[PDB]
Design a protein around this motif. Structure first.
Motif, mmCIF file in Angstrom:
data_model
loop_
_atom_site.group_PDB
_atom_site.id
_atom_site.type_symbol
_atom_site.label_atom_id
_atom_site.label_comp_id
_atom_site.label_asym_id
_atom_site.label_seq_id
_atom_site.Cartn_x
_atom_site.Cartn_y
_atom_site.Cartn_z
ATOM 1 N N UNK A 114 0.193 -18.083 11.964
ATOM 2 C CA UNK A 114 -0.924 -17.798 12.885
ATOM 3 C C UNK A 114 -2.109 -18.642 12.477
ATOM 4 N N UNK A 115 -2.667 -19.376 13.442
ATOM 5 C CA UNK A 115 -3.760 -20.321 13.178
ATOM 6 C C UNK A 115 -4.900 -20.093 14.183
ATOM 7 N N UNK B 157 -10.504 -19.732 8.368
ATOM 8 C CA UNK B 157 -11.419 -20.854 8.574
ATOM 9 C C UNK B 157 -10.820 -21.615 9.780
ATOM 10 N N UNK B 158 -11.646 -22.077 10.730
ATOM 11 C CA UNK B 158 -11.055 -22.806 11.864
ATOM 12 C C UNK B 158 -10.246 -24.012 11.367
ATOM 13 N N UNK B 159 -9.123 -24.275 12.031
ATOM 14 C CA UNK B 159 -8.328 -25.433 11.692
ATOM 15 C C UNK B 159 -9.151 -26.686 11.986
ATOM 16 N N UNK B 160 -9.121 -27.669 11.078
ATOM 17 C CA UNK B 160 -9.856 -28.924 11.342
ATOM 18 C C UNK B 160 -8.985 -29.871 12.081
ATOM 19 N N UNK B 161 -9.440 -30.340 13.243
ATOM 20 C CA UNK B 161 -8.663 -31.297 13.992
ATOM 21 C C UNK B 161 -9.302 -32.702 13.952
ATOM 22 N N UNK C 220 -4.313 -19.683 18.313
ATOM 23 C CA UNK C 220 -5.306 -18.829 18.959
ATOM 24 C C UNK C 220 -6.742 -19.325 18.834
ATOM 25 N N UNK C 221 -7.501 -19.167 19.927
ATOM 26 C CA UNK C 221 -8.957 -19.458 19.853
ATOM 27 C C UNK C 221 -9.707 -18.229 20.431
ATOM 28 N N UNK C 222 -10.568 -17.626 19.619
ATOM 29 C CA UNK C 222 -11.316 -16.465 20.122
ATOM 30 C C UNK C 222 -12.409 -16.896 21.068
ATOM 31 N N UNK C 223 -13.110 -17.965 20.701
ATOM 32 C CA UNK C 223 -14.281 -18.404 21.472
ATOM 33 C C UNK C 223 -14.215 -19.701 22.182
ATOM 34 N N UNK C 224 -13.131 -20.439 21.995
ATOM 35 C CA UNK C 224 -12.992 -21.726 22.637
ATOM 36 C C UNK C 224 -11.573 -21.815 23.187
ATOM 37 N N UNK C 225 -11.062 -23.040 23.249
ATOM 38 C CA UNK C 225 -9.702 -23.232 23.698
ATOM 39 C C UNK C 225 -8.905 -24.022 22.714
ATOM 40 N N UNK D 219 3.533 -20.174 20.657
ATOM 41 C CA UNK D 219 2.655 -19.359 21.523
ATOM 42 C C UNK D 219 1.247 -19.916 21.443
ATOM 43 N N UNK D 220 0.514 -19.936 22.566
ATOM 44 C CA UNK D 220 -0.904 -20.371 22.542
ATOM 45 C C UNK D 220 -1.675 -19.285 23.293
ATOM 46 N N UNK D 221 -2.849 -18.875 22.791
ATOM 47 C CA UNK D 221 -3.673 -17.890 23.561
ATOM 48 C C UNK D 221 -5.120 -18.083 23.216
ATOM 49 N N UNK D 222 -5.962 -17.520 24.084
ATOM 50 C CA UNK D 222 -7.391 -17.527 23.882
ATOM 51 C C UNK D 222 -8.093 -18.130 25.071
ATOM 52 N N UNK D 223 -8.780 -17.274 25.798
ATOM 53 C CA UNK D 223 -9.575 -17.698 26.932
ATOM 54 C C UNK D 223 -8.819 -18.386 28.043
ATOM 55 N N UNK D 224 -7.549 -17.990 28.240
ATOM 56 C CA UNK D 224 -6.774 -18.518 29.346
ATOM 57 C C UNK D 224 -7.128 -17.611 30.523
#
Ligand code: FPQ
Ligand code: FPQ
Ligand code: MG
Lengths: 253, 253
Positions: B142-143, B158-162, B186-191, B211-216
Motif C-alpha cells: 500500500x502506497x 511519507x508521500x511516494x517521491x516521483x 492511493x491519494x487522499x488529497x490528489x490523484x 488497485x488505484x483509488x483516491x478522488x475518482x
C-alpha cells in the motif's frame, strides 16, 4: 503476552554485550553429552549466547525439547535456535529455548523463504506451547554468499552479488525500513567478504545486530570480522571434531 | 484449513475478472440500509467485489459483523474489508467477510505499519473466530501519493517521491520478491499519476493485482486509469451523497 516478535531480553543482550565469537552447536550432529561439555566451556569464555542450528532436522520437537533443557542446565547463557522453516509447519520451535532466530531469506527466489514462513509461523502460534513460555523471536535478514547449491536447492537462495552494491543496498533499505533486529551473513562454501561486512555495518542502524558465519576456523578470522564491524562471528564446524577444546581455545584466544 | 495468507477464491476472482471500477462503501459513514441499496446496484453493474473500508473505526466487531451480513445478503459479490491496523490488536476482522485486504505500508517510517502489523494479526489468529470461518488475506503493498498529513499522522506514511523512479523501483522489487498479491496506490488529497500506474503495471508480475483509488469522481478518470494498467479503480466519496445513483451511472459508463 511475552515479547514474541517485539524486542525482549535476548535481543537486548545481543545489542549490549561485547562483540565476539559465538559457537554454534548443530544438535542433530553433536551428541547431547558433547553439547553439555561444550556449554560449560562456552560459559567460562563469556560468549553472548549458545546457538543451536542446523540446515537439516527431523523429529524436531522430541529431540530438541530435552536437548535444549540439557544445554540450559549446563549454562546460564541464552539458548537461541536457528533452523529453516518448512512449508505447512513454518519454523520449528520448542519450549525452553530463549529465542528463535527467524531468517527472512531476502535473496531467495521462493517467497515462502523470503518471508511467508513468518506468516505461517505466527498463524500457528501459540500452538502447543503456552503463550507465556514461548521463546522470543529475533527477526533477521538472512543472506548467503558464494556458490551454494545445497541451500539453493532447499531454500531457493541465490548468492548475493558482490560485483557492486546494488543488491546489498536494496537489502539494507529493507532491513532498516522493516525494522529487522539482525542481519546474518553466511557462506557455506566460501567466506563472507570482510568488505561486505563493513558495508553492512555502515548501512545498518546502531541497534541492528550483525552476525557473520561460515568457515570461520581461526581467531585471526574472528578478529578480522569484528574489526570489519560484525557484532558476532559464528562458528560450528571448527569444533565438530575430537580436538575441539584446542580449537575453541585458539578461536577465542 | 483456511487458505488465510495463501491465494484463495477471492484472489483468484480478482486476478481473472474483467478490470473495472470498484465501489468502496465506508461502513462507519454509510447507513447499512443505504449500503444494501448500493450493493444491489453494484451487482447489476458486474463489479468484481464490494469493498468496505475506512481510515477510522471504533467498536469494529459489534458494528461490522451485522453490517457485513446485511451486505452479503444483498449481493453475490465477495465482500472485502480494508482498514488500518492498530498496535496491540493488528488488523480488525469479523466473521462473514470473504477477505481482508492487508496493507503493508512500505513508505511508512513506522515499521509496525510497514509490516509488523501482519505479524501481530497472524499471531492473534484464530482468536474469537473459528479457523474455518476466517476470511482470506490479500497481502498488499500500500502506497500513498500527494501531501497527506492525516495518513502520515496516523500511519507514518511519507508521500511516494516521483521525482525519479528510485523509490517505486524499490517497492516493485519488494512486491515481486515477496510475492505480494496486490499493490494499492492511493491519494487522499490528489490523484495517483497515471504514469505511476503504468510504471507499476509494467513492473509487476502478471498475477499481481493493481488497485488505484483516491478522488475518482468521473468515468473519464476510470477509463484513464484502466488504460494505464490498473486492474481496479476504487471510489468511495463520489457516492457519499444523495444523488449517488446518478454519480454511479456516470462513473460506470
Ligand atoms: C541460510 C541462512 C543464513 C539461514 C536459513 C536457516 C538455516 C539454513 C540455518 C542453519 C544455520 C546456518 C545458517 C548455517 C549452518 O552452519 C553455520 C556455521 O558454519 P560453519 O560450520 O562453517 O562454522 C551457522 O550455523 O551459521
Ligand atoms: C493508506 C492505505 C492505502 C492503506 C492503509 C489502510 C487504510 C487507511 C484503509 C482505508 C481505505 C483507504 C486507503 C482510503 C479511504 O478512501 C479511499 C477511496 O477514496 P475516495 O473517497 O477519494 O474515492 C479508499 O477506500 O480507497
Ligand atoms: Mg496465531
Amino acid at each position: 503476552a511475552p515479547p514474541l516478535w517485539r524486542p525482549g531480553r535476548v535481543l537486548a543482550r545481543l545489542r549490549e554485550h561485547q562483540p565476539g565469537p559465538v559457537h554454534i552447536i548443530d544438535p542433530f550432529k553433536v551428541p547431547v553429552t558433547e553439547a553439555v561439555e561444550k556449554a560449560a566451556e562456552l560459559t567460562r569464555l563469556g560468549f553472548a549466547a549458545v546457538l543451536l542450528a542446523s540446515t537439516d532436522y527431523e523429529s524436531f520437537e522430541s529431540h530438541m525439547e530435552p536437548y535444549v533443557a540439557a544445554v540450559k542446565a549446563a549454562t546460564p547463557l541464552p539458548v537461541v535456535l536457528h533452523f529453516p522453516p518448512r512449508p505447512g509447519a513454518g519454523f520449528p520451535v520448542v519450549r525452553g529455548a530463549d529465542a528463535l532466530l527467524l531468517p527472512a531469506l531476502l535473496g531467495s527466489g521462493d517467497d515462502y523463504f523470503v518471508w511467508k514462513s513468518f506468516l505461517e509461523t505466527l498463524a500457528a502460534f501459540p500452538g502447543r506451547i503456552p503463550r507465556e513460555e514461548w521463546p522470543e523471536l529475533l527477526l533477521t535478514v538472512a543472506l548467503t554468499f558464494g556458490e551454494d547449491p545445497r541451500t539453493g536447492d532447499l531454500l531457493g537462495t541465490v548468492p548475493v552479488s558482490t560485483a557492486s552494491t546494488e543488491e546489498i543496498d536494496r537489502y539494507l533499505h529493507v532491513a532498516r525500513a522493516f525494522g529487522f533486529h539482525m542481519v546474518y551473513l553466511y557462506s557455506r562454501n566460501e567466506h563472507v567478504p570482510p568488505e561486505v561486512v563493513r558495508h553492512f555495518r555502515k548501512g545498518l542502524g546502531p541497534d541492528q545486530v550483525l552476525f557473520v558465519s561460515g568457515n570461520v576456523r581461526s581467531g585471526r578470522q574472528v578478529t578480522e570480522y569484528l574489526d570489519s564491524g560484525a557484532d558476532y562471528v559464528g562458528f560450528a564446524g571448527a569444533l565438530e571434531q575430537p580436538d575441539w577444546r584446542s580449537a575453541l581455545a585458539e578461536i577465542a584466544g
